[PDB]
Amino acid sequence: AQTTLMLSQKSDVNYLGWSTDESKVARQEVYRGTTSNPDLRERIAVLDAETRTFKDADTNSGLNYWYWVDVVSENQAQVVSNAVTTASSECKPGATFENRTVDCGGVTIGTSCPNDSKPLIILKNATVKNLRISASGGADGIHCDSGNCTIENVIWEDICEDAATNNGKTMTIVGGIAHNAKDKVLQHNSKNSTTVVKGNFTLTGEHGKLWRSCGDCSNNGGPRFLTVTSATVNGTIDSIAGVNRNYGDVATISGLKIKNYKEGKPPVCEEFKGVVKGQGSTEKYGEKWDTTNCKVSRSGVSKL
Ligand SMILES: O=C(O)[C@H]1O[C@H](O[C@@H]2[C@H](O)[C@@H](O)[C@@H](O[C@@H]3[C@H](O)[C@@H](O)[C@@H](O[C@@H]4[C@H](O)[C@@H](O)[C@@H](O)O[C@@H]4C(=O)O)O[C@@H]3C(=O)O)O[C@@H]2C(=O)O)[C@H](O)[C@@H](O)[C@H]1O
């Protein structure tokens, strides 16, 4: 197998994002050192088998750091990633991948962020992994335009418009770090489709919503589904999910951690009235728990 590791430095905190193709994961260990020498690294954490991200806030600046992540299987096999520090050619803006998995090997891409009224990567029943979207060249992020798409270990240094848009059947977010400065992270426009969030997808900075079933799209309708099983918001966010109840949307949220979380701060699942473009405006009903459209108990959300 293989483990590909990437690092994002935001607000004096080091965020690690990795993808692994190991099958029966038992645990994952994070190693950190003050030099390049792997032999001098030390275990600063032993994590569970599902997370694909890690936050190291116990670092002092002025000092460079090297990181490695060791993915261990049930058969105790150890798949150590490449080193990342604070010190393929197919992944370029405007690219379209179809019916395959493209490993971007941790490269950075971007164009620019327009000022008016443009997808960076379009996936048609495909998967993209180990990709970093630059701070200025975000455009309209990643578009899943058909079939099942997986966006694995993608780091958004900043979000220009939308981080990822589900215009397909199923959009799965596995791990990844999404940063934004003052917004829509996951935009869902297709109908009879699902958006899955796991691998502890992490949002940092300032955000609007983690996920929003389009409220006023042209030819709007539903149903649209969201299933969050693992995610973390280490910053401020207006709300987590926005469902159109009149359209049959269902948001199921568990395994979510939020920095300084408190009832209504921020609201998690909110119900709206969806409208067709031009035929009115979208009104917010409010935050809801354990309803037909908002399937999330207070047990599924906790303070980071
Ligand atoms: O004509 C189209 O179909 C259009 O689709 C894409 O754009 C999407 C929406 O059509 C567009 O109006 C916008 O919508 C978002 C959000 O999804 C929508 O619910 C609404 O959000 C309101 C409020 O305006 C926001 O500021 C915030 O407070 O949230 C509110 C809410 O009810 O949740 O308006 C939003 C917005 O204006 O950005 O973006 C949608 C998107 O997928 O990005 C295409 O991008 C567009 O070109 C066109 O094809």
Side-chain angles (χ1 to χ4, degrees), residues 162 184 187 189 209 212 214-218 272 277 282:
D162 293 344
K184 223 91 54 187
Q187 245 299 306
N189 302 326
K209 294 180 188 65
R212 179 55 158 119
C214 195
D216 61 10
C217 276
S218 293
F272 291 78
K277 185 83 76 181
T282 68

Side-chain angles (χ1 to χ4, degrees), residues 2-5 16-31 42-55 68-74 76-81 152-153 174-176 198-200 230:
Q2 178 168 261
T3 304
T4 299
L5 180 66
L16 306 177
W18 65 89
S19 64
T20 188
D21 57 353
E22 179 72 303
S23 49
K24 299 176 182 60
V25 186
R27 70 171 190 279
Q28 300 168 298
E29 307 176 342
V30 177
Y31 289 89
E42 49 183 9
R43 202 182 309 120
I44 60 154
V46 42
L47 323 164
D48 62 30
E50 61 83 23
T51 190
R52 290 300 179 268
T53 60
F54 178 73
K55 171 187 67 276
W68 295 260
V69 166
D70 186 11
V71 172
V72 193
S73 76
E74 231 100 63
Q76 232 60 24
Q78 305 185 258
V79 190
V80 185
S81 72
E152 190 172 18
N153 191 37
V174 185
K198 63 176 182 176
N200 197 17
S230 187

Side-chain angles (χ1 to χ4, degrees), residues 221-269:
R224 297 188 183 115
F225 313 112
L226 171 66
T227 290
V228 168
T229 54
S230 187
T232 296
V233 175
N234 200 20
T236 46
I237 198 170
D238 297 356
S239 78
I240 298 303
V243 291
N244 296 320
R245 74 160 177 250
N246 57 311
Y247 289 158
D249 298 348
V250 182
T252 144
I253 301 160
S254 75
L256 171 65
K257 302 178 173 186
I258 305 180
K259 176 192 179 59
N260 296 327
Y261 177 71
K262 286 194 294 182
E263 52 187 85
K265 295 187 172 191
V268 180
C269 191

Side-chain angles (χ1 to χ4, degrees), residues 119 271 287:
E271 307 191 341
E287 183 174 22

Side-chain angles (χ1 to χ4, degrees), residues 216 273 275-282:
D216 61 10
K273 180 196 62 193
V275 297
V276 171
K277 185 83 76 181
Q279 305 177 14
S281 65
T282 68

